[PDB]
Amino acid sequence: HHHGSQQLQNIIETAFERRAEITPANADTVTREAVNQVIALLDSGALRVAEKIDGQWVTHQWLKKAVLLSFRINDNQVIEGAESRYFDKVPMKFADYDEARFQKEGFRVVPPAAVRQGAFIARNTVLMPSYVNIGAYVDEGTMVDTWATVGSCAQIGKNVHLSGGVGIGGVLEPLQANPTIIEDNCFIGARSEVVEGVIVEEGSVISMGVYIGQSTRIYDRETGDIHYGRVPAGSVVVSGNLPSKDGKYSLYCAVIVKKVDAKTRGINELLRTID
Amino acid sequence: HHHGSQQLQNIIETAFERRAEITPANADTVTREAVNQVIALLDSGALRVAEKIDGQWVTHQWLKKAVLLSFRINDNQVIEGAESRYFDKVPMKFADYDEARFQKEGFRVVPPAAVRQGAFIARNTVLMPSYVNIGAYVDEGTMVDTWATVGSCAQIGKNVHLSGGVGIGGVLEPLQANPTIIEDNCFIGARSEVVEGVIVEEGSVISMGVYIGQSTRIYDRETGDIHYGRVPAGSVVVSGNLPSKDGKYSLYCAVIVKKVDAKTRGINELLRTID
Amino acid sequence: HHHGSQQLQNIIETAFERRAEITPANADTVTREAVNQVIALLDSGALRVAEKIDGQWVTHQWLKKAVLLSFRINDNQVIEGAESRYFDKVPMKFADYDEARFQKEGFRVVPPAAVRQGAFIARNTVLMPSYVNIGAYVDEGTMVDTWATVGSCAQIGKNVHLSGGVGIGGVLEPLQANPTIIEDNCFIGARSEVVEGVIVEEGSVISMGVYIGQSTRIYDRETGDIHYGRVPAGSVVVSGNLPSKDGKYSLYCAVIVKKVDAKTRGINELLRTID
Known part of the structure; x- marks a missing residue:
């Protein structure tokens, strides 16, 4: 509803520079929304961490930054299994x-x-x-x-x-x-x-x-x-x-x-x- | 209720020859029943894909054909897990x-x-x-x-x-x-x-x-x-x-x-x- | 409610000597309770099978005996999964x-x-x-x-x-x-x-x-x-x-x-x- 690819990139890059001060409790709504949308785009294959261009492999560091921020901004929660129980944030x-x-x-x-x-x-x-x-x-x-x-x-x-x-x-x-x-x-x-x-x-x-x-x-x-x-x-x-x-x-x-x-x-x- | 081992073998072999035209939608009842019974017999150890006879290993190709037909005749369905979800036909x-x-x-x-x-x-x-x-x-x-x-x-x-x-x-x-x-x-x-x-x-x-x-x-x-x-x-x-x-x-x-x-x-x- | 570490050790050691005659049906209450408490202590890290002392690795055989007795005294039971079912005693x-x-x-x-x-x-x-x-x-x-x-x-x-x-x-x-x-x-x-x-x-x-x-x-x-x-x-x-x-x-x-x-x-x- 808000951000295209260049906007997402900037929001991610800006948040990543200040990641030391970001916690699951204090992460702002815009950062969270941008991180969420990037994960969704990676999930659907609409974005990809590396891709082969002019027949060469280029890496998008900003997509790695988004993945790393997803870890920072989410708390671990109990994950109900059947015979086993888990505790994770992804x-x-x-x-x-x-x-x-x-x-x-x-x-x-x-x-x-x-x-x-x-x-x-x-x-x-x-x-x-x-x-x-x-x-x-x-x-x-x-x-x-x-x-x-x-x-x-x-x-x-x-x-x-x-x-x-x-x-x-x-x-x-x-x-x-x-x-x-x-x-x-x-x-x-x-x-x-x-x-x-x-x-x-x-x-x-x-x-x-x-x-x-x-x-x-x-x-x-x-x-x-x-x-x-x-x-x-x-x-x-x-x-x-x-x-x-x-x-x-x-x-x-x-x-x-x-x-x-x-x-x-x-x-x-x-x-x-x-x- | 219908087939012994030689019958099963023939039903499987005959279906396998025409497997290109068999789909989960059109597979006939006799073929499906025979494939199901063979899988059951493999499951119980009553049949086995290879066995050692006169102290030598003999392979029953027709049992492999039955396994391969089981894949052909069954659609993938959603398989409910607890924390994970799956989608498969076996x-x-x-x-x-x-x-x-x-x-x-x-x-x-x-x-x-x-x-x-x-x-x-x-x-x-x-x-x-x-x-x-x-x-x-x-x-x-x-x-x-x-x-x-x-x-x-x-x-x-x-x-x-x-x-x-x-x-x-x-x-x-x-x-x-x-x-x-x-x-x-x-x-x-x-x-x-x-x-x-x-x-x-x-x-x-x-x-x-x-x-x-x-x-x-x-x-x-x-x-x-x-x-x-x-x-x-x-x-x-x-x-x-x-x-x-x-x-x-x-x-x-x-x-x-x-x-x-x-x-x-x-x-x-x-x-x-x-x- | 009953046993400290030396007591647990003796109870375990004594039971282990006669393990051939212990079954899930006949295992006595004291043995079962002691085995249960040892497992709990291993689970919490309060006891450990081996530990480094005076900068050398010492092995507590009696803790292995307790683990082995836990297998002896418990029956396998059905373990409900979601898409899979299991059958085990641990x-x-x-x-x-x-x-x-x-x-x-x-x-x-x-x-x-x-x-x-x-x-x-x-x-x-x-x-x-x-x-x-x-x-x-x-x-x-x-x-x-x-x-x-x-x-x-x-x-x-x-x-x-x-x-x-x-x-x-x-x-x-x-x-x-x-x-x-x-x-x-x-x-x-x-x-x-x-x-x-x-x-x-x-x-x-x-x-x-x-x-x-x-x-x-x-x-x-x-x-x-x-x-x-x-x-x-x-x-x-x-x-x-x-x-x-x-x-x-x-x-x-x-x-x-x-x-x-x-x-x-x-x-x-x-x-x-x-x-």
Whole structure:
């Protein structure tokens, strides 16, 4: 009823500068209303924490500020479960969904999957029992498998498969840092973890038990080059080690063992053709 | 009231051939009834997706077809939670269980463990908070520990321990492929994953952080032989790597570090006696 | 109304010696009352399974005996969920908590996190969706992240971060063995597992995908020394491998790659400064 996107941004930015003095008791009506509207827009996918523009990933720090203010301005309250009881300050996404709205929005939520309000879930996606945190964006035709986690602000592309127990790391702070990004058509194998704003580019295949943050060496065995923070598009990636200079030990790394071209970006068939 | 096992099989097989034209709106009564009865039989353990015959694992593709048809013929509906709401087409196993039936069937379900209808849980097993998917068979005296997953169609033997965070991969497609099988008396260490129809034979001990699918080399260090798709009975298996030819890197594998005889198949004591 | 700590200990110890003959039907009133009071004291943090004295970890076997007797003396009962139903003998911690008590005790429980009664959660801690088992102690200012597990009897120190999917192994048996201990100010990276009474000392930083039980070699690369069962205070630990004598394969280990002094014990900054 009051604010468009630039207004929201300014209201959020101004409130964030003085956040030290904001409490759930004293937060003003305009700030609260603006924070509420931003969360609603994140929830619907109308706004998103990061987005790819001119084919590059841009991060909207102000949307992270809004999420952080939502924590500041809300008190924890008792949350009635059935067999369990909870105590938290972030509402759940589907509290007001009925059959018509679930049918309209076009995704499936398999119990006991849970999603916080402020996260967008696109049509044709399936949430097996899993967790999707505030600020996340999960695009169309994606599978989030059992005990997987989509962290705060994470951007999951279309036709992605997050296998069982896969975690995509949240990034609220630092404000300037891009969230963790899985681009379109990626497969992430079971028990893998991609964190700290690492970008896995389109059409990549990551096997089981692969852990990649900003400190993880991503070894291109064909060239000997080492990547950090980015899995180039079409990469097939498995766990490995690199030897020490003394030869007495080796340390964990990811290894790019195959590269698939744009015009072709079968999971088991790719992994078969190794060595 | 109508169909025995051969009839069910034919009804399922015939419906499956024409599945492209079957919707939740138009599915006929006989098909629906047959699909419902098959799910009930899978749920009770009276039928099972794979079984070991003349001491060999045989897969009943038609039971997978029935599970797949159950998805086709049922609409998603709103599923009321307490603090969360869901939207899915597969009912939960214990909806109609009372105290008498839980006492009769003889297992424990520790909250918030969840099991889909169409999965069999045998007596003396304990489900810590975990997930058991449709088509799975979990035999007697087994522990499914916290955040473990028993995937679709998976066969878990008697006296098995699935440690915390262990995933047993589902296999619905391809139809012909055996599901993931853990034979009797196996220990699977925390955070391990066994997928894609790999068979772990009786009395095996798999340590923590071991990931085995069809592409995973299982290195027998004693002989230099490489296994795929099968952990031979009595094997003690840990994570390792194999070196590249250039010596510049190594890649992930499982390693058989000890072999225990039939007449003897202590977990910490076995792992202690390494090197 | 009846028993202090030494009385409780004797009542528990005496009952434990004759536990073979104790059933939920025949358990006497005094034993039941004593077991109930011990669980209450564990729940409130007034008693704890292990504690550090004269700066050393001492284990109270009798508290484990009380937990074990609580299992013996209680029948499983139906536990009403909403969309799911359960069947177990251990009550949940927050059944009788209201807003005032949650505010007093000072922690947050994010749905669907679950905690069994008999576990202590200190103020300023956050339980993301996770599991905390009976007998555990979780001290102040700690984060238990999504799909993490704090096992039975585990002692988690102040200002600890248990990242996503981290498991801290339970230790009820053997009775004499210390539980798994994470000392104050430790960071444990995603998907890591610390089990079997391993002690991670103060100010340690464990990266992602690190698995440490009593059989895991902890390799100090600076000295060539191998540790078992203990991560010395201030250690920075990553996954690695050690080569075999034949050079044909390597096996999993943890590697201490950096050591931080007492007077200084940034996570990404530490891991950056490797090699």
